[model samples]
Target: GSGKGKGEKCTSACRSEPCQCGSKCQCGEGCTCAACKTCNCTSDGCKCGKECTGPDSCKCGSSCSCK
Candidate 1:
């Protein structure tokens, strides 16, 4: 018989708290988790984001590949 089956749900470990990395949290309303926090572009590299691409570049929520 073809029917709906129960499935598990996947959730992130991060919680709804201030970023510990000291990065700027620019997530909109109802956004929780450190990953949601935004980064501060600097000359050296991105500050606390998915990746750091120098002090003036960053890839928010992902890898930092400077153009």
Candidate 2:
């Protein structure tokens, strides 16, 4: 099958929050999103949301990316 050759190294992790990883983060496997949600970073960038106010090392922004 044809595929894009572009590649880059990035960090990823699981979080118990919706849209926590921006575009890079995708909802995890499960159907219990009534009051709880989770997401996993499936590709490049940190596993953090656009509105993340975590520590300085895990800071996120509009164009969120690992720093």
Candidate 3:
């Protein structure tokens, strides 16, 4: 692939959709950049930036954990 110029950013913030961050490829909430996957989950099911594990253990969704 040709490393071309940067592309325009997404006008709307995709709450669960995958969109480049800062007009560049980046991980969004409940989304994994490494694997290029998005987790369409609810607030309780989508663990974006919080630590979760144990009795309320969570599953790895788009790199993040969600119980």
Candidate 4:
């Protein structure tokens, strides 16, 4: 179940894996860590700062003000 085909779901799948700097939690894939449940993996996981425009647009330590 879990949307995945039979034997496709791994207990230690990416969902179960902890969220990395540029990784996010994909539901139904595996177990997800509480801390990384809401992480934005598409844009280097930047929580604060400019809205991630694209993969190359993410900049660390950048200050962003949403107006």
Question: What number of backbone clashes does candidate 3 have, counting pairs of residues 3 or more apart or in separate chains?
Answer: 0
Instruction: Arrange candidates, best TM-score first.
Output: 1, 3, 4, 2
Clashing pairs for model 2 are 20-48, 20-49
Among all windows of 10 consecutive residues in model 1, the one with the lowest summed lDDT is 7-16
Q: Candidate 1 lDDT (Cα, whole model)?
A: 0.37
Q: What would the per-residue lDDT of candidate 3 be over residues 1-67, giving only the tens digit for each residue? A: 9978543332333223443243332434343332234333455544354433322333454334332
- lDDT against true structure, model 3: 0.37
Q: How well is each residue in 1-67 modelled by candidate 1, as lDDT tens digits?
A: 8777533121222233333323333334233243534344565554554455443234344233321
Please provide TM-scores, in order, for all candidate models, with all chains considered together: 0.21, 0.16, 0.18, 0.17
Task: Please give, for residues 5-43, the per-residue lDDT of candidate 2 as tens digits.
Answer: 532222232244332344443434332232222223333
lDDT of each: 0.37, 0.34, 0.37, 0.35
Enumerate residue pairs that collide in model 1. 42-55, 42-56, 43-55, 44-54, 44-55, 45-54, 45-55
lDDT of 2: 0.34
Which is superior by TM-score, 1 or 4? 1
lDDT of 4 by residue, 1-67 (tens): 4665565332333433343412322333333234332333255444454565333443332122210
Of models 1 and 2, which has the larger TM-score? 1
